[model samples]
Target: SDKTEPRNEVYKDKFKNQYNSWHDTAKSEELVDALEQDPNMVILWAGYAFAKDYKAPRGHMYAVTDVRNTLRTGAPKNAEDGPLPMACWSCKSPDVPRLIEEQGEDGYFKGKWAKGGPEVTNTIGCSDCHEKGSPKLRISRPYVDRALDAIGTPFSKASKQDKESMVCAQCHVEYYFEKKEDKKGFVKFPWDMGVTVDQMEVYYDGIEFSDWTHALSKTPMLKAQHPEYETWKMGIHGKNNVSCVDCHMPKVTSPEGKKFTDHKVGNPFDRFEETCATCHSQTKEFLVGVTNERKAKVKEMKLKAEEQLVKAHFEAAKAWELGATEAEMKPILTDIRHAQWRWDLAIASHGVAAHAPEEALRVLGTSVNKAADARVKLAQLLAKKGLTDPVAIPDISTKAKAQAVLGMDMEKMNAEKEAFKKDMLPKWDAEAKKREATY
Candidate 1:
């Protein structure tokens, strides 16, 4: 249907001339590269695989490349998936749709991640959102198919604006593995019941699916992947029925004077005249100020949620050290799970703290409540164990120290990864090259 090489085919039906524009912008890697700069992510995700390595979301074009580089995925050895499942690749490549079709949905999803390395090369591209050999937008991911269908608005029938958002939702929303299905770790978005945090908590609880056990708390914790699409849907932009494209993909006139949606996906701040100024009567400075002020308030709440959650994890850990049994800490752990999920729901989304201020605050407020209740119950449990003082934890003030507390071997992991890259990355590149050449 479509060819993968030369990269010039992107302009098949467009006035575009610069072929590498998307690839260039993707080099920013501004989102994920800055993860370690702030200690919040490292500490919050401590005791998990993410703590092994975490980075902000790079641009769309690097979806594949970034995954290969990140610490979370763990570098593979030969066909061995160093740490994760093949389902992890769902969001990273256009090759995903191709592979899913070839392997069958469940078969492809449950297969090993690294084993398919030779099969996935191209990053997010035209074949992803566009129909092959045609300009019409199409949804290719089956997970999106399942989610949209369950929501009673399959991609075929969704409004154009919603379709614009749905493509991003294909990967941007939070999901857990479908545990009940035969294919373990099959990617499943928790939208059948609803997309809200509480809605997903209920869904995960019903299935007893958890990302991992908290090393410190021994609680069955669920990790929230980025949920930009889910949170944006709760904002004013969503309620007013504007899609992400209305801002992120605003139209621009090229040097040749042809109008096209700017393929460079990012915050609208960089193109206020073309994006924000198109509707808002305010000057860009005024709008930037107003939005920044709103963002500040939302950020304030985010910090509080993070603080509560960080302390909650340590508290749970202390309870365990005090000999708190699983039965004794069940409800407390549930509270931790619910509270942290809510925190992640708000914090993980790119601009929800500012985009949907009220909604973000409400979620954070609920997190505070849940977290405090867990701590209160924890105090009672500790008193019963004759440990009435605040439990002390090692200094996790920094990311390195936090990882040390979590017993992660960062140096060894990095060494193994470098071995994978040197040994397998080129092998994958060649194998992927050999396969795509047939197209």
Candidate 2:
């Protein structure tokens, strides 16, 4: 029923052009737009380049350009001008694996992001997920192996499926780069307790760590990134043994009948037959129905979570305004942290509820209850302060209003950032070029 080989090269050329074209402009624009919309996202990322400015990932084609343009690197004026660490390039480029192989694990992560800017040219590519001379997926990061050992499970003993999943986990999960006294910067995953939000929080709490202070409340806060792959594990699809590649890299057959995992990581519904039909022997109509049912459930839960989050923030703000003492603030702040963590775990997992409906709803429902409880306690605290009248809520319905409440001077900040880019970036480029020419 399938052709073993293609009859013409015209279609192949057309496909290549189409993919390249999309990678060049449209995709790059999308990443930039996403980053611009959430500029404050960097605040939660204090002490990290991500804190400077972060955009959603574009294709590998734009990785180098994206890194060059991001404000986080301080707009490298010359190769030597940027203050970034060499470690920043690890996840962004293929050069990391090579550098690690040459320098040893301890040495690879021993510098700033900009130090290796000239050496790390290629984006996340075949070398990142594959062996140097083979197609076999390998765990290239020594830290990953060390982490596995710390958990009492040697990565060498893992099953093939586990190994495949681990390759994706290298960059897809929550991680922080730490600077030890002797080591410059090293990547670490705080998963000793496990992957659950409660477990990770326990680990962080044990260390009394906080990423940054909340702009309004000044309470220490934890920010969640795209924990999509991890949080999705709690869902039904994960319980049923679904991997990320199941939906994002479903099998596809080219015209010549060559089957390969579609490298395009996107919504599964984009190609129902290749993705959904592999497990469920249903018609396209039935699959859509299934997807819709799950999506509806996700929508309901997401709305509830959003309402709860806004209320939690407002109530916490009220408590702060009422001159609540540090002792009184601790519990309320903890609740805010936990409640939002749940909300983030739910929403951050893009399309996960549809992939695993029941689990997503459960987490979201728990978040709603936790957030409501926090608000109720805050209301009691305000009443104790003789505030019989309802606490007035600030208008934070728009970005400008929210920034004003947070005391952020957006106009001034943007102007300074523009100046930095124009004056500093070219100098860094020249230095990087000089260094690369030597290599």
Candidate 3:
């Protein structure tokens, strides 16, 4: 009973801390301060809404809570209004599958995010990956079911190893909302062409897809979500048929002398002795050291790419200020789009550094070169306009300075977020509890 029942509470408590350290590294100063905002008097989500508050994802338990609290959601006036589409909630909870069952896929994806506010109470849990009352794994996400089918690897025909990893792939892979007529804002993976960086880029280009326009450079941008499964598919471990479960939920023995898969899905480094040791004969210190070394090298390239991309954006904006035409800037803007896409794919998947270090380096290297190319073209355009001096970069060293440059009022946003929590959050929670009591 201790092993079986208490394991629920054990996971709920312990897993909350799983991603804290990673959060420290990823909690960009640019997005941190805006996390504290009130619910009203919005300035409109001009660029990527995430540019408002891009914090690292926490544990599964916080899925619904975190989204509710994010400034990106923006305090909707009610169930029918918001900048975010209903598809944003598709990955956040078991309640997503629940609502889809009730609402149908089209109905579920047709509304604003707030449409599910009163019903999606449960955090991510067993139902997301298992058949009800059965141990048999299933793909609960309809979009993943569709994606695998499109790739000629339908879930119904997947091998045991594929099934194991595809469960994680439900939320971990790169995806975008459909912008096509009759399927607007429906969640879809860009896997029709392929899953590689270049292949997905081709697919998106074929559709002329872009997530948002950069506020500064006015370049159309693609923001990559956590593409762990996509990058893992390109890695040595994936090539060798390593299931995500093999390391993240490795086998563990209970005090009652029974072995079971640990439900506490998390970073494998946390239990190297139990997880990595099953495959690698190396010591924990040695394996972790190698992992860090690989990540450090990739980090160097990622930073370089980011710096170049920032300069390219400012330079492009300067070109526009100096009377450059869209016809002239079109090619350079495309380069900025592609450069940021490559950089985002490399860094957004937190484990890419260790999952596929060589691929990470390659993607980031291309990102650096693309941004450099865009900057050079911008300089040439400026020179043609008779502006010989280089465009000056703004002093955006601190959080306040950066937000100021972006024209964001963090204080106003933060106050609105607080109002949202105090006024709106309780109403949702109260209604959800009432709805769940019958179950």
Candidate 4:
């Protein structure tokens, strides 16, 4: 019931907000906070906004709306101040690319997120892919253009299939907020070294870069955003050159004998015949059964790794409290970082079990080993520091409990969002409509 139709006519405008209502996406049980679902995530993501509140991935239509409502963004009074930078809004709308054309990347990216509120009315839509007034498909995001060029497969030289897949990669790949002199918070793909997890780790470590330090363990941490493109590239399907559109936007024939690409892009399970059955000869039931089994196995390994990683963080924190030297903790902290990184790669990238079951298992297995290794080293350090008893880890069994453990006041956070929605949102809409009226 939380997802419903819009009461206001402005929200119903498809040309403005791409989705007319929240009903476009169903409310699934799986749509809970990621850290809350598995409290271990809370320990690992201690110093980040993600630890405060990170929900399951939702539809593209909810992109802008979700960002505004999420606790991580916080509430800002106007266009010049917010928890996130203007660059955070880059992938949420086609308006961003349009704004870039007018304001250039510097103007669009080098400010606060709220500045984009009135300008970025249009959600993800045709302009993101299709050229305005032309039949040609194009690359919309500038970073994608630069990243592809860096990787030696420039968009201009890519084939039709490669272009299709790369368009998805425009936002799907793992990216970092560049903090160079002129490009603060500029979104950049870490594809300079390579797209693999180890390669990206090396690149980040070489620059001594980290998203945030773990509040508990004080380890420099890397938060893996959904690196779907990177994982897909590592998977068998991507190696075979099967484009994203092949399964997601397959061709469909109308009852009236017309045929067109199915534009309501979604998971292949809903239309297995047109997607999976194109090559596989197995019955739909058998194929789905096998897929679920693999996913279950991957999930099992992930949980095991999560448990060890959470314990490592708590143990490391205890060592810090007991006067453990930074020199003694350095190697153990590195293990925690690497372990969590691998675990995050497995979980953060959606559908990894289905996309590449073997690779997913391989990554998760390593995560389990490294996390266990960290805990062993931490245990030895704790004994040396004169406390052998198990470090008392706080109870973080639920979302509220975990947030409380971290001293996050959900009441205050919700109140801020309420104030923003009630006061700032209407003004933003009015300005957006006024701007569009002249267009």
Q: Write the per-residue lDDT of candidate 4 for residues 1-439, one digit (tens) a residue.
A: 1111112223434422222222333332235567666777776788788877788877666677777777788888988877888888888777877778777788778778888888776556565675653336778878889999878899899999998888788888889999888878889999889888888888888888888889889999988988888888888899998888787777666556666565555667777888889978999899889889998998899889888888898899889999999899999999999999889987787678877878888888989888888998998999998987898878888877877887878898889888998999889889988877775
lDDT of 3 by residue, 14-95 (tens): 3333223222322322332332231110111136686677665656667777788887888776889767888988887777
Which lDDT tens digits does candidate 1 get at residues 28-75? Answer: 666554445656666677667777777666577777777887777777
| Most accurate candidate by lDDT | 4
**Cα RMSD, model 1:** 2.2
Q: Model 3, 189: alpha-carbon shift in Å?
A: 0.7
Off by over 4 Å in 4: 1-30
Candidate 1: clashing pairs of residues: 31-56, 32-55, 32-56, 86-113
Between candidates 2 and 4, name the one with more favorable lDDT: 4
Query: The CA-based lDDT of model 4 is what?
Result: 0.79
Instruction: Report RMSD for candidate 4.
Output: 4.9
Ordered from best to worst lDDT, the candidate numbers read 4, 3, 1, 2
Regions of model 2 farther than 4 Å from truth = 1-29, 32-60, 64-88, 103-116, 150-154, 179-185, 254-257, 416-439
The TM-score of predicted model 3 comes to 0.90
